[PDB]
C-alpha cells in the first residue's frame, strides 16, 4: 500500500499519517493558517496537516523559537545526535548514522541552495555549521 | 407470552421472555447485530464556560477510547435499545480500529435508560467513546457506533465568539489539536 513520510498507507491504498506520529521530526519555524504571526513547527506535523488539508505557511530558520535549533543535553537528543561516554552533553552524528528515515528538505550551504536528508541537515545543525534552512520542500537543484 | 383464536385456532401467535433482567443487548436492521453491555450514560451541559480542555484529551487517550471525532448529528431511528443517531462527520481524532477516512455519515446508536445523554437533530457536537462492533448484514457493520456508557458528549459551537464566549470553543479546538499533536 501507497505510504509516504506524511503517510500512513492502509487497506490495499494510499493514506495520511497522524501529525502526533510525525511529532519527532526536526523543529523549525513557521507561520499561522489563515495569519501572518509566526511560531514553531515541525516539518511531518506539517506535512501530516497539509496531507488532511489543514492550512499552514512558512518562515525563515530564525523566525521562531524551535527546539530543535542548538545542539542539546544528554538523555534527550534529536535523531541526529546521541549522548557521548561518561559526559553530560549530547553530540552530533555522522550522515552515515542516519537510523530515522526523515523528509528530504531545501537548505542553503556554502552559499548555494541544495537539497538534502532532514537527518544530514540536522546534523549539520548540532555540529555549528554554517546553514539556512530555505523549505520544508526540497529544492529545483536536482532538475535534468 | 401466546394466544391462539378459540374460533379459528390456526391462528396462533408467540413471543419469548423470562422473569430475569436482561443485560446482552444490541439490536441492528440485519439477520446478525452486536452486543452490549446493557449500555447507558449522561452527557456534559452545552456551552460551559472554561470547561476542563485536558481531561478531554485524557479521556481520548484513554485504554478503552477508540472512537472520537466532530460532527453534526443528522438524524434519529425508533429501535429503543438502539434508536439509530446518524451523522455529517466533520472531523476525526481517534476514530480507531479498522476505521478510515471522514465524512461517512454513519450511525451512533441511542438507549431508553441513557435519558442524560439525548442528541438534537442538525446540532454540531463532539464526542468520545469505544470502538463499532465490525460485522452486521452488510459486509461489515463498520463505524456503526454503540454510544455506550461512560462515553463523553458535548455539544459544539456552530458560531462561536458572540455566545459568551469563544475561549470555550477555543479550549476544545487546543484539545482536538493536542489529540492531532501529541495523542496518547
Redesign the interface.
Known sequence: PKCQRWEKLQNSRCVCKMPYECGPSLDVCAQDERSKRILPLTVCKMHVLHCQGRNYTLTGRDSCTLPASAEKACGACPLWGKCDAESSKCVCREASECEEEGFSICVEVNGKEQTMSECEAGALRCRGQSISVTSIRPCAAETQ | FTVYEYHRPDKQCTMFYSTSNIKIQKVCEGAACKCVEADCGQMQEELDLTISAETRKQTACKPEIAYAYKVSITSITVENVFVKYKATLLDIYKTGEAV??KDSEITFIKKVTCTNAELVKGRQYLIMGKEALQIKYNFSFRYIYPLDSLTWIEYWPRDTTCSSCQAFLANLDEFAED?????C
Open positions: 478510515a477516512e489529540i492531532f499533536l501529541n495523542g
